[PDB]
Design an enzyme around this catalytic site. Structure first.
Site, mmCIF file in Angstrom:
data_model
loop_
_atom_site.group_PDB
_atom_site.id
_atom_site.type_symbol
_atom_site.label_atom_id
_atom_site.label_comp_id
_atom_site.label_asym_id
_atom_site.label_seq_id
_atom_site.Cartn_x
_atom_site.Cartn_y
_atom_site.Cartn_z
ATOM 1 N N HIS A 2 27.084 31.342 51.506
ATOM 2 C CA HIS A 2 27.913 31.848 50.418
ATOM 3 C C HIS A 2 28.954 30.955 49.754
ATOM 4 O O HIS A 2 29.697 30.237 50.417
ATOM 5 C CB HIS A 2 28.623 33.060 50.985
ATOM 6 C CG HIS A 2 28.792 34.166 50.012
ATOM 7 N ND1 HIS A 2 29.930 34.305 49.252
ATOM 8 C CD2 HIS A 2 27.982 35.197 49.682
ATOM 9 C CE1 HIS A 2 29.815 35.376 48.491
ATOM 10 N NE2 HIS A 2 28.644 35.935 48.733
ATOM 11 N N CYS A 9 28.044 41.903 46.831
ATOM 12 C CA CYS A 9 27.112 40.987 46.163
ATOM 13 C C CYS A 9 25.908 40.695 47.050
ATOM 14 O O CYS A 9 24.760 40.765 46.594
ATOM 15 C CB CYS A 9 27.799 39.687 45.714
ATOM 16 S SG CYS A 9 29.235 39.185 46.665
HETATM 17 N N1 LIG Z 1 33.672 37.079 43.629
HETATM 18 C C1 LIG Z 1 32.573 37.671 44.077
HETATM 19 O O1 LIG Z 1 31.548 37.038 44.347
HETATM 20 C C2 LIG Z 1 32.594 39.196 44.265
HETATM 21 C C3 LIG Z 1 31.370 39.859 44.086
HETATM 22 C C4 LIG Z 1 31.234 41.242 44.263
HETATM 23 C C5 LIG Z 1 32.337 42.021 44.623
HETATM 24 N N2 LIG Z 1 33.572 41.376 44.794
HETATM 25 C C6 LIG Z 1 34.616 42.245 45.337
HETATM 26 O O2 LIG Z 1 35.279 43.012 44.318
HETATM 27 C C7 LIG Z 1 36.710 42.759 44.455
HETATM 28 C C8 LIG Z 1 37.216 41.822 43.327
HETATM 29 O O3 LIG Z 1 37.726 40.565 43.905
HETATM 30 P P1 LIG Z 1 37.609 39.097 43.191
HETATM 31 O O4 LIG Z 1 36.827 38.172 44.093
HETATM 32 O O5 LIG Z 1 37.350 39.413 41.743
HETATM 33 O O6 LIG Z 1 39.138 38.631 43.280
HETATM 34 P P2 LIG Z 1 40.237 38.427 42.136
HETATM 35 O O7 LIG Z 1 41.467 37.984 42.846
HETATM 36 O O8 LIG Z 1 39.743 37.523 41.054
HETATM 37 O O9 LIG Z 1 40.383 39.918 41.537
HETATM 38 C C9 LIG Z 1 41.516 40.727 41.890
HETATM 39 C C10 LIG Z 1 42.396 40.903 40.681
HETATM 40 O O10 LIG Z 1 43.227 42.018 41.062
HETATM 41 C C11 LIG Z 1 44.559 41.722 40.664
HETATM 42 N N3 LIG Z 1 45.430 42.740 41.296
HETATM 43 C C12 LIG Z 1 46.093 42.705 42.465
HETATM 44 N N4 LIG Z 1 46.799 43.820 42.708
HETATM 45 C C13 LIG Z 1 46.538 44.552 41.636
HETATM 46 C C14 LIG Z 1 47.046 45.826 41.404
HETATM 47 N N5 LIG Z 1 47.863 46.464 42.231
HETATM 48 N N6 LIG Z 1 46.646 46.398 40.259
HETATM 49 C C15 LIG Z 1 45.827 45.761 39.412
HETATM 50 N N7 LIG Z 1 45.343 44.537 39.620
HETATM 51 C C16 LIG Z 1 45.693 43.910 40.748
HETATM 52 C C17 LIG Z 1 44.655 40.245 41.028
HETATM 53 O O11 LIG Z 1 45.650 39.478 40.323
HETATM 54 C C18 LIG Z 1 43.308 39.706 40.534
HETATM 55 O O12 LIG Z 1 43.353 39.150 39.208
HETATM 56 C C19 LIG Z 1 36.928 42.130 45.844
HETATM 57 O O13 LIG Z 1 37.178 43.111 46.849
HETATM 58 C C20 LIG Z 1 35.620 41.413 46.076
HETATM 59 O O14 LIG Z 1 35.184 41.386 47.426
HETATM 60 C C21 LIG Z 1 33.721 39.957 44.609
#
Ligand SMILES: NC(=O)c1ccc[n+]([C@@H]2O[C@H](COP(=O)([O-])OP(=O)(O)OC[C@H]3O[C@@H](n4cnc5c(N)ncnc54)[C@H](O)[C@@H]3O)[C@@H](O)[C@H]2O)c1
Ligand SMILES: NC(=O)c1ccc[n+]([C@@H]2O[C@H](COP(=O)([O-])OP(=O)(O)OC[C@H]3O[C@@H](n4cnc5c(N)ncnc54)[C@H](O)[C@@H]3O)[C@@H](O)[C@H]2O)c1
Ligand SMILES: NC(=O)c1ccc[n+]([C@@H]2O[C@H](COP(=O)([O-])OP(=O)(O)OC[C@H]3O[C@@H](n4cnc5c(N)ncnc54)[C@H](O)[C@@H]3O)[C@@H](O)[C@H]2O)c1
Ligand SMILES: NC(=O)c1ccc[n+]([C@@H]2O[C@H](COP(=O)([O-])OP(=O)(O)OC[C@H]3O[C@@H](n4cnc5c(N)ncnc54)[C@H](O)[C@@H]3O)[C@@H](O)[C@H]2O)c1
Lengths: 358, 358, 358, 358
Positions: A194, A166
């Protein structure tokens, strides 16, 4: 033809991507969401997570949970705006997923557990054509930041792309106009105030990787780190080794702000820069880089799909009057919304180049 | 002799219990902490978790991380106030822990993963005599609330005891004096405005058990549930089926308040009760039930070890003027602190009865 | 004819009222906002406060600041959806305001400074016909809760009406159906977990009136009081002296919840009550009392204009199984949005009876 | 002899100063607090604001409210550790206070309403010798930052001294050793992630001066401004026009952090700098500039009296590897505690130079 997609990890980014798909009207026709995957397969729980969101409110679409064969107890199919989506069970290994059978070409990896190129190649081994990692990918995958180097995508070479982070989707657009407009960057250091995320703790718990990050998220100013630090150079190689930074995680659930400080290659002014960013925002970066002339605060950027929206007032008002080199540029971004909309863009674009070649 | 104890799950309640032991001067002499158990075994990390706590500040003791045999890379021994404590590696099953070898008699179950009597017996099978579950235990274990029914402990029958919950250790004491003082409780409903815990999420994530409980912790008023609901009857059987309640989780890292509403058996007044709770506080409930006549707010109770501290002003001012039956009684408690102090009391008390018998 | 109105105190409630008038489309035609009054008269700042709201987002209408005569430096007229609204300078006394001159018949008292009937009569002395106080008014003004006793309004007697408080607008409708549906309430006590407001402090400061109420708003659970305690009886006289309660202010910027506990006159069940409230919600209380069968949390009620939305699951799940008298009823409300919508309702309804009479 | 002092504005800084006085043991002997001034004169309310502090906990001293002549209803005298302090009524103008009568020589101006040298001179006109403004003073008063230029004080010229701002007391010590150790600062830009203060609002309200600053404090990241921006140069004239910055206010009640980025005059390394700051911290800046090698987060710094505590890990870890000019230095500070301890220091040192001369 409808782009066949699947979401692995239906989290913040998982659900925000799906939402960007349904709200832009792409669902069903342009893009086709075949199956979402997470811990449970209760379409009912998914339906609830989709209808009510703390930070973004209720989605514009309509969702329902239906059990396919009346023999299964818990519903297992989401019905979003007339379209059956399947609820697949989570696998510890990507290659275990029934992608190929399901008929999924583009897998969106957002569980956060498989940032590695090799760990993410499993989706291909599971029957999928391409994979887009929703985070800085390791193992040397292709890092692309829409509006900066999407053109560099190779339908033949690149099969496991990474949409960076992000913060990266916020800084890179800026770094782009800065070089392209010939202001150049000699050496730069950046900080990002952040919002906290799913990886932080409500109360002091365990985080063996980053010691500070394990502290009560909503109660402290936690110095941490940013993906954008590395990822920026992999998009704009020109800046490799010439840019680095950190992040301070603070008590806000969403929306962040980049605070860049750099030294230009040539003598110039803050008005010059301000003028070039606004211009760039209305021309070649439109939809990706935007700006603001208002006295806005974090909450005002929630649901703003621009990858990075520069702060005019904040920047002009906080630079040395007599200065031609040492500058500061403030820019906000809704880390869950913008980034998610960039992932859908990458997919659709990757699909365009994939239609040309393979 | 020094009571031989070990802590399974060095978390919020894990660390506060160990702290209550060092701070009361019990460490080394009265009580002897042999080993602490958690995900990692890096005493350096433990050291850090112990010296800086967001809500309770720095502990009074001194902690150091030392690697036993210079062959091990990461430290694995905590040296609190001149005393070697070992960092045991976490096991998926309790019976796999080297309790009997280590020479641990009393196991403190605070990982939250083994609230079941049978899942908890594993510690005995691992070489431990008694086990105290830092939460409401299932499988019919012995539920004891210090100051209400600790006498009921049986060194012969009871080997897996449960110290009830934080909300239980607050409501129970009040329910005790209400009955003992002959005011009697006919029917009663209670709510507890509770601070959030390790089990909640920073952002809207997964909570398959309680749907609401998965929402942004520090950003919502989340209706949920309380252990005290059930646990109360298991300590004061007289109230079984005549008392129930809910809890609202709110954006505060620690300290909660119980808001009990009940109907008395006989005619009485709010002053009568006010007087009886104060008297009880100064006599037979001393150290467990306390009270306040001050205009305090949540922060004022942090680090207060009383199981429950009655709020005189909030109660007196918020009850019907002409009333002899329908009442309200507000009372605070520092859910991580007081409860932790009760755990240590239970252990020491249990060790006393075990010295008489077995 | 367009109802001539003016708002005194363009704050949270001031701005939400104006917004409810513009969004429902009432502005310009049905209702006519003549002038708004606050500390400053800078239409530019007003426009800013209007276009960006932390909790409710950007309004649907469009606003502009224009200086009338080019001789005035700062803009002094808002132009909302094609309609000139004047920015009047604040007066220490209501009677000093140019209402009659401006052509304002209905004054909306929302500064919070003149809750007294007599202090509020000043607007009439200043040239206004009727005045609606956005809070419990003293000096014996007419307390009306839309959907409960608006019919009791007297165009001849009542010239200074009070729209009760937000908690009153949520408890009253519930108390109304409880009596009307013949369940009756013998004795009742209520607690409201309320969001903090403008009268609280970011950090420990002064509040000579309520001591606790001066503490760090967003960091403590502050026991306090509610207007609804008294106001309820002034609307439903049947309950006078039979109902009272308190409020706990918690770290959330908006949306609160009522937690009522009462004893019925006749034997009954929780399902009977549940059924009656949902029925009442779909029939005679529609638009005022609503309900939900979903697992919602505070954020989910933001922008919900019902005066009170009953929580079915929370209620049904948190009552005694064998019970016919002692019940609990949980209900949510957006304290700024719903209440503001009720004030516009009252105005338009008052204008209707004033057109019949005077 | 006991320094005769009076406090004007018994707020966050007012009470923290008095606390530093009572806790360091200075009360009564070294320093003599004659009277405290605020809105009310109810020593009871004062007692309360002194005994329970959300962020700093209960003070070490003992306070009591006693009414002098039994004729006065409300107490008007605080009795802190055996010493009668008077509760004087607040005056709209400083020159109206009874300083000269009371026997007060040094007035601590902390109401925040009189930052002007001329507005503050009224204390002298009220009968006071010297005045210390707890904030950057206007009207050209003498700006002094303990540990940087207190020596520049002139018992003859300087009668209205300003102790700069919290951020200033944090950045100055750092800019000091940077120049004193010959690293030199060419051009610099800084940002301070700052806790919110008594001047911010709980909810979107009015703030005619800074538009952004009036938004909901505890819910947004509010870009604002810092006093240290200008003040820095008035202490180290060598930096005038060569350093400027901004502040981002975030949802934390206390403790802030400075994030400085500058360009050195000579080639050097981050380790060099790291070495010089720790050294300086152990020698000529001891007690003013401290440092830390631990993985600390905001809450860890609460109650830390050092004006500025350098973060070794955060800085070492977040600077360009190949770099000799462009650097970043991170440093914390408790904005209410440290700064207050600097005010007491300034007073006593001013008293020292005043006993030498006048
Ligand atoms: N929140 C932000 O601002 C943001 C922005 C850009 C990128 N991201 C990145 O993209 C990724 C998404 O993370 P997030 O912040 O959405 O967290 P999140 O916990 O909301 O998303 C992860 C999801 O994956 C699920 N999960 C776990 N193991 C799994 C598996 N084996 N198979 C399928 N699903 C599974 C979890 O229950 C969860 O619902 C992270 O690495 C994060 O750094 C986050
Ligand atoms: N904090 C409170 O308010 C409170 C009050 C009363 C009771 N309790 C109860 O005590 C328990 C823990 O509460 P908490 O706040 O300490 O939670 P926590 O998350 O702080 O404790 C869990 C800890 O145990 C560790 N852990 C998990 N599995 C483990 C395993 N298999 N072996 C060893 N360590 C393991 C986790 O890494 C973490 O360190 C729950 O049963 C809870 O109800 C908590
Ligand atoms: N927000 C709520 O929760 C809520 C709900 C129901 C009722 N109310 C009641 O509504 C009223 C409005 O409250 P609020 O919460 O919106 O507060 P607010 O502080 O945001 O609104 C008050 C406004 O009145 C302005 N004002 C003060 N004196 C004035 C004067 N002399 N002339 C003109 N303007 C003046 C202030 O400058 C401020 O802009 C209060 O009485 C409150 O009790 C508030
Ligand atoms: N809070 C900080 O971080 C910080 C840091 C540096 C400097 N200071 C300075 O301290 C000054 C005061 O701020 P604070 O944080 O103590 O706020 P505060 O509002 O808590 O304290 C100011 C106090 O002055 C009292 N007061 C107001 N007008 C008065 C008057 N006319 N006469 C007598 N008393 C009056 C108020 O009742 C209040 O208690 C500000 O200029 C601030 O910059 C504070």
């Amino acid at each position: 033809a409808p782009i066949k997609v699947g979401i692995n990890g239906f989290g913040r980014i998982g659900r925000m991507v799906f939402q960007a798909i349904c709200d832009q009207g792409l669902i069903g026709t342009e893009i086709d969401v075949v199956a979402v995957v997470d811990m449970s397969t209760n379409a009912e729980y998914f339906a609830y997570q989709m209808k009510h969101d703390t930070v973004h409110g209720r989605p514009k679409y309509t969702v329902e949970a239906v059990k396919s064969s009346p023999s299964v107890e818990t519903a297992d199919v989401l019905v979003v705006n007339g379209h059956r989506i399947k609820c697949v069970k989570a696998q510890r290994n990507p290659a275990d997923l029934p992608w190929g059978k399901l008929g999924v070409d583009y897998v969106i990896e957002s569980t956060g557990l498989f940032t590695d190129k090799l760990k993410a190649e499993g989706h291909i081994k599971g029957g999928a054509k391409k994979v887009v990692i929703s985070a800085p990918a390791s193992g040397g995958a292709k890092t692309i930041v829409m509006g900066v180097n999407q053109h560099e995508y190779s339908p033949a070479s690149h099969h496991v792309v990474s949409n960076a982070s992000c913060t990266t989707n916020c800084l890179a657009p800026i770094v782009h106009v800065l070089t392209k407009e010939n202001f150049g960057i000699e050496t730069g250091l950046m900080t990002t105030i952040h919002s906290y995320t799913a990886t932080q703790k409500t109360v002091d718990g365990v985080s063996l990787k980053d010691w500070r990050g394990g502290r009560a998220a909503a109660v402290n100013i936690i110095p941490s780190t940013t993906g954008a630090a590395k990822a920026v150079g992999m998009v704009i190689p020109s800046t490799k080794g010439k840019l680095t930074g950190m992040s301070f995680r603070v008590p806000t659930p969403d929306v962040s702000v980049v605070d860049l400080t750099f030294r230009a290659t040539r003598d110039t002014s803050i008005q010059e820069i301000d003028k070039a960013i606004k211009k760039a925002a209305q021309t070649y970066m439109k939809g990706i880089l935007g700006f603001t002339d208002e006295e806005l605060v974090s909450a005002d950027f929630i649901n703003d799909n621009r990858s990075s929206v520069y702060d005019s007032k904040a920047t002009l008002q906080n630079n040395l009057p007599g200065e031609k080199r040492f500058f500061k540029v403030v820019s906000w971004y809704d880390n869950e919304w913008a980034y998610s909309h960039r992932v859908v863009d990458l997919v659709r674009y990757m699909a365009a180049k994939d239609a040309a070649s393979s």
